[PDB]
Amino acid sequence: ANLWERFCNWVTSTDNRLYVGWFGVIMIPTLLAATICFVIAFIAAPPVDIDGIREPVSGSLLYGNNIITGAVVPSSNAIGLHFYPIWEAASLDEWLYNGGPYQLIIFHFLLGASCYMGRQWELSYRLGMRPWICVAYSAPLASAFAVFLIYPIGQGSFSDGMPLGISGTFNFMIVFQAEHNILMHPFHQLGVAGVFGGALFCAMHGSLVTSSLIRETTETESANYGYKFGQEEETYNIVAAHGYFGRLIFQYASFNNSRSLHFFLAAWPVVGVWFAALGISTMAFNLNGFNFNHSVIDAKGNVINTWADIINRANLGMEVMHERNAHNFPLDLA
Amino acid sequence: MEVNQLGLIATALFVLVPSVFLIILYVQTESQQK
C-alpha cells in the first residue's frame, strides 16, 4: 500500500478507539476550534455590543458573570448577516467588541455537528448496521440550526441568534414569545408533546423492562449483575411486561412486538422535535403562533377577554421592555 | 463582586465530601480479592 492508501485505511479503520472517518476529518478540527474558542471566550472575553447600539453586554466569567449569567454573546446588529471572520477586523480588540467569537464558534460548531451526523451514518456502514441513528440525531441538529442559523437569516442578523449561555438562552426564549407567540404555535406544541412524551415513554419503557427482569441474582447484590454483556438470551420477560401494561390500560394499547415498541420510542420524540425545529425555522419568517386577541366580543361589541388576551398582556410586557434603547420607530419589524 | 463569603467553602465541601466517599468505596472495591 502507498501512503494515501494507508492513510485511507487508518481514517476509515473500524479499530480506532474513536472512529475518525471522512466526516470526522472535517468534524475533528471544526469542533476543536469551536470548543477552544468557546472556552476561552466564556472565561475571558470582554463585553460585546450585541445590539449594535454601543451598549456592550458582558458575557465572560472574568468580567463579572457566573456560570448561570455567562455567555458568549451574539455578534453585533451592525454586522447583521455579514460574515465577520477574524481577518475582517482591524484588530482582535475590534473583533472582540463586535462579537466575532460568536460567529467563529457557531459556524465551526454547525459544520462539526453536521459532520457528527454524517459520521454516525459512516460508522454504521463500516459495522454492517442499519443506517438511521443519524436520522434520529437530525432532530436536535435541526434544532441547533434553527436557533443559530435559520432564525438569524429570517430576521436579518446573527445578533438575534440564541446566545451561547444559560441566561442568554432564556432571553432568546422570552423575546421569541413576545415576537412570535410561540406558545400558541402548533409546531411548538407538537415539540412539547415530543419532549414530555419522550420523557413519559422513556420512564415507561425503563420501568416496564426493569419490572420484568428475570431473577438471576440474590438480594445482597445489584440485579444488574444478572445481565452479562453480549449474552444471547433476553434479560427480561416481554410477555410479562406486555401482560402487565396491557392490563394497566387494555390489551391492544400495549406493544407485544419489541421492534414496533422501539420504533415508536425513536419516532415519537424525533418527529415532535422535528416539528419544534420547524416551528423556530418558520417563525424565522414571521409566520407566528395563533392570534386570538379580541376574538370574543359581546352583543354590543365589548371585548370579552379569554386566556389568549392575558397571554397577550404578558407578551406586551416582554415586547415593550426588550432591548430598551434599540428601537426608534413604533413597530418592531425584525 | 460582592459574593457570599461562604460560597467557596460550601462549593468545595459539596464536591469533596461525596467525591471522597465514592473514591473510598471504589478503591476498597479494587483492593478486594479477584
Binding site: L61, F229, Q231 | -
Partner: peptide, 30 residues
C-alpha cells in the same frame, strides 16, 4: 475566587471525560 472555582469544576469534568473514555472498565463478552 468564584471564577477559579467555576473553571476548576469545569476542568475536573473535562479530566473526568478523559478517564471515563480512555480508562473505562472494558466491556467483555462472557
Amino acid at each position: 475566587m468564584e471564577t477559579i472555582t467555576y473553571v476548576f469544576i469545569f476542568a475536573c469534568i473535562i479530566a473526568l471525560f478523559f478517564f471515563a473514555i480512555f480508562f473505562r472498565e472494558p466491556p467483555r463478552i462472557t
